[PDB]
UniProtKB/TrEMBL annotation, chain A:
This is Capsid triplex subunit 1. GO terms for biological process: viral capsid assembly. Keywords: Capsid protein, Host nucleus, Virion. One of its GO terms (cellular component) is viral capsid. GO terms for molecular function: DNA binding. The lineage of its organism: Viruses, Duplodnaviria, Heunggongvirae, Peploviricota, Herviviricetes. The keyword Hydrolase does not apply. The keyword Transcription does not apply. Disulfide bonds join 82-203. It comes from the Viruses. The chain holds residues 106 to 466 of 466 of the full protein.
Automatic annotation (TrEMBL), chain E:
GO terms for molecular function: structural molecule activity. HAMAP family: HSV_TRX2 (MF_04019). This is Capsid triplex subunit 2. InterPro entries: Herpes_capsid_2. Disulfide bonds join 1-82. It comes from Human herpesvirus 2. Keywords: Capsid protein, Host nucleus, Virion. One of its GO terms (cellular component) is viral capsid. The gene is UL18.
Length: 279, 307, 57, 98, 299
């Protein structure tokens, strides 16, 4: 009812929202203790399915689940772990200087191996680490966590807009699509662009910028790419991060919390959307 | 609603102000999200591209990259439109006008189709503001998916001639009775070609490795034909399935991948999505509060969200 | 007119109301010349569409 | 307490069953509703007024909208009262040729 | 919200009353949205479409057609349900009853057929007025799309016989799909019509495309770009399938619409779109079978 609260109790083995900002684009970790099984399934047999059986098992080594399940993944944890992967180096790598000095690359180094191992056996990182929200409160303990980081529509950026102002956490991120500029409202999405066996199972996390519908986004997902050179398949999944109902309030900064480039985005209808991955 | 207005820009033909009154509940394709916008991008002259007007398959592609909007209230100064793509958050269920020869149902998903009918052109003309208006025809979605397959395949017959001139017209439609004839006047090629390619390229990926085992059971299909009712009615007479009847190819690597289960996945990925990648997305659903089971031609039906 | 005018303006927000030192004070008003340069006035425009004044010389 | 015509002869004796039979009450809805526009919400409460009599005059034309509507729904029950009786009689009415 | 009332009919027993006490928080389908409704619009006997009992196809036609309603508070003489499909997005929190998987903190759960699980579980019958309330199963979007394609794949190996498809691990648990002893013999006769639908839409199109594309490209931007992204994929499928199978334009393009007409049916039939969301507050983020969950309105 244009104001909501959500809560999930996890560890600070992940994000450590005390080390994060007030505004962070948190993911969950849905199906957290999953993927020894789907490592074996869903892949053609030339992928040697005994890789992710150890790969996530080295992740929680860096992080026993207990009663506080592994979850609440930060926005930082994918950018810096793919910083060595995608086509931005020493600028996306400034996100690694943000994490390891505030959060830890010990958990990144196990997970950057997962980002070459999850995508290896066709266990693609979309529909795992589902969207949760914008880190409203951080009522966490010392080594444990209790975060309210509301999902559920536009109210996350009104109740942090009548007061976290939604950073993009990298100037390389918030992909400035539509340089063909005009007035309107912004429509935000979460795309994982892949490269399968060309760049050896590439991982990518960035947000697009468009005044485009979901039907005007799929052909926009076929155009503007140079990573078509694959053949397996089902690359470039995306869901709706929702509407920023203003293109006027975007910004360009390098000040956060290590000087990391960052984009202020004030006022967002967080339509949670749905994923799609077929081609 | 997240209110969006379109003003009356310049002058009025005095009966044509009443023509804007009887368009309450229709749909405007405005290619933006504005707090105010001129009426110039509204009409079909904006639908016309550089030099050339779209065909009824190009208008599908023209209605692709624009935004539908519902006429809510009609002022002599403005027209308040509600942005369907975002502002469908209406427990008041903002109302639409059915301009269609089909009496629908209760509970139909409703998708929008350009005017292609033989007698429901929806042509209203403004001469003070020199503009032409084609309103889309809201229709039920299986009947909508029965139309778009006809018009592309009619343009598939625009590539190759070969056959004698007596072709099956693709111009007789069937809803419980109700013989419908549509318009076949012009078929622009690029609207056919780009629609044909995605019909090709999606049907490429919808075949996989474990898909091939299913092809063995094609003679198994006709074994059910002469021994039941359901199968024999399922098997169409104008089908290639009755024509193709007149094998593992071992290559077995590993055999723990579930090859038959993986076949139905990627087939559904692309051949399962063939109505919506060719046509417009349905977001309008029939929902009347009074318990009325159908909605008459010309009525004001209440409209709820995405199906 | 004038006193009848704003008497409902105060009431409109009134029914919408249910819906170590001093010198923190400055004061202000502006009238008098605020009618002189104006050099005519019709108050109370209602729901109106067209205003015609015709000239005969 | 049904009568007895208690008999002569050795046919056995009549026996008064003064039984209590029960019935069951139904439950009915009888629902009615009426609209109210997007204006006349600030009006009829006291929000959108002014010192203009026009503000009072269109405040009149919401009152003369409700004053016809309240009698319409309060009428609709008394109209609806008879319509139930035509259902509950015809529900227990057998056809009189039988 | 806009709570809607379903009328309890006449004389029921106390176990029929207690049957109404074991359903507080289930999912209910209804045809129209009248503010007073009866129980005659609710029951599985109200799902007859051709004079016979519906199959899992005949339910999933209606399960995508009519409207979900969730009973908040049970009543004598009434049934209060605050329906899902009315109301603005992410408002009007409602409460569900879980079935054997988790329903995690997210997942956007989907109503679907009973006989994909135990068939005479959740087919709760009223004894007095003799009707049947077969409540749908609320499964979240990944696993709901998973299990729907497995039994119809298991229907193939049950169709014309000569690995085992039924293990299907969850994140933690091992989900026993097979309820062997009396269900699986009823499975392959209650998904009976449905397997024919997944087959005939494949046998038609693949045997149509292999006489479409050779009839195309020579009858040119779509020509060379046909196998451009399909190099060694479609020509390899032309090498594999057209050899071990068999090989007409005016019936062909007549069959073009008809298959793709059936294709547009199945997309509305299959894939089980999300209707309601779990995104709770101050919970343990993990729901168990038989426990309530705060469930919010729109995906």
């Amino acid at each position: 009812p244009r104001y909501h609260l959500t809560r999930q109790v996890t560890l600070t083995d992940l994000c450590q929202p005390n080390a994060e900002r007030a505004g962070a684009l948190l993911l969950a970790l849905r199906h957290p203790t999953d993927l020894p099984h789907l490592a074996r399934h869903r892949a053609p047999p030339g992928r040697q399915t005994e890789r992710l059986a150890e790969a996530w098992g080295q992740l929680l080594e860096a992080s026993e689940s207990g009663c506080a399940r592994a979850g609440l993944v930060s926005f930082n944890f994918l950018v810096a772990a793919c910083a060595a992967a995608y086509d931005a180096r020493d600028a996306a790598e400034a996100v690694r200087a943000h994490i390891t000095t505030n959060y830890a690359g010990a958990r990144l180094d196990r997970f950057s191996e997962c980002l070459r191992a999850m995508v290896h056996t066709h266990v693609f990182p979309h529909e795992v680490m589902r969207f949760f929200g914008g880190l409203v409160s951080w009522v966490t303990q010392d080594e444990l966590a209790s975060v309210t980081a509301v999902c559920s529509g536009p109210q996350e950026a009104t109740h942090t807009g009548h007061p976290v102002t939604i950073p993009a956490c990298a100037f390389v991120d918030l992909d400035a699509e539509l340089c063909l500029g005009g007035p309107g409202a912004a429509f935000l999405y979460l795309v994982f662009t892949y490269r399968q066996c060309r760049d050896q199972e590439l991982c990518c996390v960035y947000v697009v910028k468009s005044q485009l519908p979901p039907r005007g986004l799929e052909a926009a997902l076929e155009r503007l790419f140079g990573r078509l050179r694959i053949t397996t398949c089902t690359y470039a999944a995306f869901a709706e991060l929702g509407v920023m109902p203003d293109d006027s309030p975007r910004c360009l900064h390098r000040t956060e919390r290590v000087g990391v480039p960052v984009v202020i985005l004030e006022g967002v209808v967080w339509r949670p959307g749905g994923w799609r991955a077929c081609a | 609603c997240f209110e969006a207005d379109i003003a009356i820009p310049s002058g009025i033909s005095r009966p044509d102000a009443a023509a804007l009154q009887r368009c309450e509940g229709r749909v405007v394709f405005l290619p933006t999200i504005r707090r105010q916008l001129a009426l110039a991008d509204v009409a079909h002259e904006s639908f016309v591209s550089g030099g050339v007007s779209p065909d009824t398959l190009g208008l599908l592609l023209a209605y692709r990259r624009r935004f539908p909007a519902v006429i809510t209230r009609v002022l002599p100064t403005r027209i308040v439109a509600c942005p369907v793509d975002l502002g469908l958050t209406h427990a008041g269920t903002v109302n639409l006008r059915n301009t269609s020869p089909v009496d629908l149902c209760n509970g139909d998903p409703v998708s929008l189709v350009p005017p292609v009918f033989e007698g429901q052109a929806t042509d209203v003309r403004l001469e003070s503001l020199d503009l032409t208006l084609r309103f889309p025809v809201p229709l039920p979605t299986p009947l909508a998916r029965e139309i778009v397959a006809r018009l592309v395949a009619r343009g598939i017959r625009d590539l190759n001639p070969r056959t004698p001139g007596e072709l099956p017209d693709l111009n007789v439609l069937y809803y419980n009775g109700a013989r419908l004839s549509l318009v076949a006047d012009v078929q622009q090629l690029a609207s056919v070609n780009t629609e044909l390619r995605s019909l090709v390229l999606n049907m490429v990926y919808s075949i996989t490795e474990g898909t091939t085992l299913i092809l063995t059971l094609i003679p198994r299909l006709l074994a059910l034909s002469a021994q039941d009712g359901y199968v024999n009615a399922l098997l169409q007479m104008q089908s290639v399935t009755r024509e193709a009847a007149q094998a593992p190819m071992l290559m077995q690597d590993g055999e723990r991948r579930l090859p038959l289960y993986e076949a139905l996945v990627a087939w559904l990925a692309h051949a399962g999505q063939l109505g919506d990648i060719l046509a417009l997305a349905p977001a309008v659903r029939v929902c009347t509060f009074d318990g009325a089971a159908v909605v008459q031609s010309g009525d004001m039906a209440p409209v709820i969200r995405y199906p | 007119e004038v006193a009848s005018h704003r008497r409902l303006f105060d009431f409109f927000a009134a029914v919408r109301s249910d819906e170590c030192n001093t010198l923190s004070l400055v004061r202000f008003l502006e009238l008098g010349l605020s009618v002189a340069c104006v050099c005519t006035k019709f108050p109370e425009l209602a729901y109106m569409n067209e205003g015609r004044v015709q000239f005969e010389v | 307490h049904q009568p007895l015509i208690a008999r002569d002869g050795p046919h056995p004796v009549e026996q008064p069953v003064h039984n209590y039979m029960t019935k069951v009450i139904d439950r009915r809805a009888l629902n009615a509703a009426f609209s109210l526009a997007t204006e006349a919400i600030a009006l009829l409460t006291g929000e959108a007024l002014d010192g203009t009599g026009i503000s009072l005059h269109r405040q009149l034309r919401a009152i003369q909208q409700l004053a016809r509507n309240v009698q319409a729904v309060l009428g609709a029950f008394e109209r609806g009262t008879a319509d139930q009786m035509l259902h509950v009689l015809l529900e227990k009415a057998p056809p009189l040729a039988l």
